[PDB]
Amino acid sequence: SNYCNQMMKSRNLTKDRCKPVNTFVHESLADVQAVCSQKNVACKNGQTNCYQSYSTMSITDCRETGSSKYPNCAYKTTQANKHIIVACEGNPYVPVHFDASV
């Protein structure tokens, strides 16, 4: 379906290039922000302010087709129920980077 084509665009992720890969989360703001107080793990980059959600979450992987091309960005929409990993920073202690989904 077209969910990804729309989302990437309305969230300005297709402005000056086509962001190849992007994950969206279909949970409450409160639920996502809560991960910041869940399972502390290492970030992909070596830092240690990342957290893995205790629960899987309803997400959606957006990945540009091999045939896509700016300014006509095109994505395959893939839905999933998976644990997310985010880097939390600041006060309030909230997500500032999406690290991974497992």
Binding site: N22, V25, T60, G90, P95, F98
Partner: peptide, 14 residues
């Protein structure tokens, strides 16, 4: 734009 605000624009679809 803040890092937090960017996270939402990019990954938040509640």
């Amino acid at each position: 734009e803040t890092a937090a605000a960017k996270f939402e624009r990019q990954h938040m679809d509640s």
